[PDB]
Amino acid sequence: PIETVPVKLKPGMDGPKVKQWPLTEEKIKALVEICTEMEKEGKISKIGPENPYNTPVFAIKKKDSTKWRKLVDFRELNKRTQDFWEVQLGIPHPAGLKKKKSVTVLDVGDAYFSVPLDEDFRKYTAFTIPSINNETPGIRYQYNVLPQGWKGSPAIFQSSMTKILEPFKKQNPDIVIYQYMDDLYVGSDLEIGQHRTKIEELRQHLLRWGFLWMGYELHPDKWTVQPIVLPEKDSWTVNDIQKLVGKLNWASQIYPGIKVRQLSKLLRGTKALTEVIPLTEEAELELAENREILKEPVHGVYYDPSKDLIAEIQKQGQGQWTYQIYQEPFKNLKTGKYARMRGAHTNDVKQLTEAVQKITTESIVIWGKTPKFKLPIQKETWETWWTEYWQATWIPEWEFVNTPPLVKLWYQ
Amino acid sequence: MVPISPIETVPVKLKPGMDGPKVKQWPLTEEKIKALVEICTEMEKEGKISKIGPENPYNTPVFAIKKKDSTKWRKLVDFRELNKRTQDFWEVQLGIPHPAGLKKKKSVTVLDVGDAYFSVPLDEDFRKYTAFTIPSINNETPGIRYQYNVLPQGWKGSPAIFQSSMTKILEPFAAQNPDIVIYQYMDDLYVGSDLEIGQHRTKIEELRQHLLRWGLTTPDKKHQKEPPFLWMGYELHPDKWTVQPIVLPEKDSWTVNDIQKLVGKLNWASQIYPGIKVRQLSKLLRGTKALTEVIPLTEEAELELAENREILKEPVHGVYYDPSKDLIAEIQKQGQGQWTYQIYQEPFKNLKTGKYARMRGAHTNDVKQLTEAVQKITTESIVIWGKTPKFKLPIQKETWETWWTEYWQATWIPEWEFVNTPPLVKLWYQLEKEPIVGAETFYVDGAANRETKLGKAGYVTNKGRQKVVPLTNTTNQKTELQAIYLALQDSGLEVNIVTDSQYALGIIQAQPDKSESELVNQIIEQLIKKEKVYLAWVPAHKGIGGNEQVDKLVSA
Ligand SMILES: Cc1cc(/C=C/C#N)cc(C)c1Oc1ccnc(Nc2ccc(N3CCN(S(C)(=O)=O)CC3)c(C#N)c2)n1
């Protein structure tokens, strides 16, 4: 692939100029080793002071792997890189990928390192290996091939990727294959025994066309909008009915015909919070009609590919986390819950970091893009620790919630 | 003659769309022209500059100044205009090391590389933008036109290209000599090692050998400075380090400029002098931009200043970094949102100290402030030493566990152990998770009139207890807090409180122990006195009894 694809920023935008955040010694040393070999293979080259651009870099360890991996936070360059229609007016996201029983995620980012980058564009991929205590000038590099995590890497490589997959797709027309950045999402509708064989048969086929040997198994069978559930009790206290009316009042924003008049009629008076109130006939009926309403999906929900996906997360305690994906408030396109985050029963940030990765993976499978997160964490805490538990080659966007939402109780 | 390697040229361009500078040359006195021509003729003999013809359409003004005892004129080229038009560079000298992150070096040499700076050539396609004109005597001949061939002093790209060119030259020497360290600062070069006085001198000669390969003569710095190195506001000693002398001035009339220069000294001194406080002195500068306004010191600002003179009475020093020893950081609460910390490896031998101030906000608590300080120390330590220190914090392990497990946000502090240094950070109250059996249930509500600012706050309870209080100069949100305060005031040690105020719940669920709102502070003082407080929320105007009865009582 001698010919480089002409890449340009968007009009009136300079290249990225993002500060490199501090790195630990072990991550600096790791990055030095990785970049020393990469420079020997011609993938990157030293640069001088006439390059003012910078993109942050750090080191992770992929899911259950002891080898250090280099990750480049290409988020700013991706927004400044022009909106890509490399081969056609756009790729139609496969709506059938979210309907398969099993989906395997392959990291095919090493195939990008075989096609060179536009010479005029390499200066925008500049990054700095920082030094401890600024005791030496930072090691400055720029990329010579397509870098992992860049928006243009799958776009420029799409013409070359579709030809590698054409004979495997020709023999398996029921297997869906989707690509997002450095990842290949390969799903089927069959028993895992033949699935790992197909997956192993896909990576060997990729190996003959020029890998990593790691996979990530998913099951989008159980991905929907989790229903609003009201309690079933035989004796209701005043406090129970108050939370019930409060939950129903909240659901009334989403659902029509939600009534609370007969349930509020139970609280006629100034009673103790622990006093048991018997349900009247008109109250159990109103509660019953509300159960029927909440059984049905939300009216007028639709995904708009022009708007942003918003992902909110609530900390529920005991390693449990709830979340909702939407574009308009009260029009949830997906809700869910997580429990017992692997290897973090004593670390809130590690659990939240793993939750963000899971929700992002689910959003990629369903809509083909990552959502913007509203994180229940202070900026300085998340900012300091999230890279220590990050294991995905992509990085989404996030903002910070500093006021406790009252709706945490309603997703409990 | 011995061949020398050419210093690789850095390609430089102007900002996109812009041309070169075309600034007119000022008229100069005859005695000034004679001094420039002499200087530039010498510079032309050294290859620094070169004569050019009139086809070059660019120009940068040149000026002649002198020193009072130095019996010579000096040559100044005002590159302010060319700098505005020159591209941006990777400014690699913005951050300096911190002395607490350095390793003790037995021997350290200083090499002058001032004559080395001129060996760095300038991009040939960029030299035409550095043209300048010496006016002729009486303006009767064409002015002498020159252009630079090397990095000009005062140009935008000179420091970055010089530092980068010297870094590239030293990279083979440093990478293959791992028992030494090299650092560049201005026209000086500092090489340190733990070798013997003999092997150290050899490496300096080996390094002088290596610089001759590109033809760089480097003698020792004129007047070899004895300990300590006065560098970037520090005192670098063979085994210790500290800041340059912090002397606080005595005065009976303090302007806001005096308080500004003050705080700068305490802030700079707070990195080695433990316990420095700067808030009560910073509160006297909340909002002002004129610098003579004599602001009288409060009794708290004097007490804070006098506490600083006591800390600054004797010089303290920081030790250098021993990577073989653990890194420990200890924090102390100091009051009014101030925190101090010490970072060390051996007890009482601090590497550095520092302070953290509470963020600006309406409500806060000690645990949040302690958490923020920990993150700042974490980030600072990773910058200086590349690792997170072990923390010793004044908070019980049981307190922190109860906090983060019940906190609505995700929070985390790295490895830490409790140190029994009062005042200890504690939780001042904890709301119940379920309603309390046998405890009186207080249904509260408030309401105000937007126009006249009149309002009412009160409650009704399950035992028939009632109260409604009229209020003046109040709002809806204020009467909602007042109603909760009345229920806390008038209830026993255990109480259930029912409110419809999403505003009040948002404040209390944030668990503050101190507030800028005097009314919130009063509510906090009431929660501390209680035993069990269960705060329940209901939506308003939905017919919830108790809530309905007291909503009508307070709404006119
Ligand atoms: C070598 C060096 C020089 C500089 C110079 C700046 C200036 N003016 C800066 C850096 C970052 C520097 O680099 C590093 C890197 C790691 N570790 C250290 N450690 C260290 C240990 C001891 C030192 N000396 C203290 C003062 N002298 S003396 C004759 O008594 O004044 C005794 C020895 C010095 C110095 N110098 C430095 N330096």
Author numbering:
A (entry chain B): 4 to 213, 227 to 428
B (entry chain A): -1 to 554
From the article:
HIV-1 reverse transcriptase (RT) has important biochemical functions for viral replication as RNA/DNA-dependent DNA polymerase and ribonuclease H (RNase H). HIV-1 reverse transcriptase is one of the most attractive targets for the treatment of AIDS. However, the rapid emergence of drug-resistant strains and unsatisfactory drug-like properties seriously limit the clinical application of HIV-1 non-nucleoside reverse transcriptase inhibitors (NNRTIs). The tolerant region I, which is formed from V106, F227, L234, P236 and Y318, is a modifiable chemical space that can accommodate various substituents.
Here we show that a series of piperazine sulfonyl-bearing diarylpyrimidine-based NNRTIs were designed to improve the potency against wild-type and NNRTI-resistant strains by enhancing backbone-binding interactions. We have determined the crystal structure of HIV-1 wild-type (WT) RT in complex with 18b1 at 2.5 Å resolution to gain a thorough understanding of the previously explained SAR. Significantly, there is an extended channel in the tolerant region I, consisting of F227 and P236, that leads to the solvent. A known effective medicinal chemistry strategy to overcome drug resistance is to establish interactions between the ligand and main chain atom(s) of the surrounding amino acid residues. Forming hydrogen bonds with the backbone atoms has advantage over interactions with the side chain of amino acids since the mutation will have minimal effect on the activity of these inhibitors. Among them, compound 18b1 demonstrates single-digit nanomolar potency against the wild-type and five mutant HIV-1 strains, which is significantly better than the approved drug etravirine. In order to confirm the drug target of the synthesized DAPY derivatives, representative compounds were selected to test their inhibitory activity against WT HIV-1 RT.
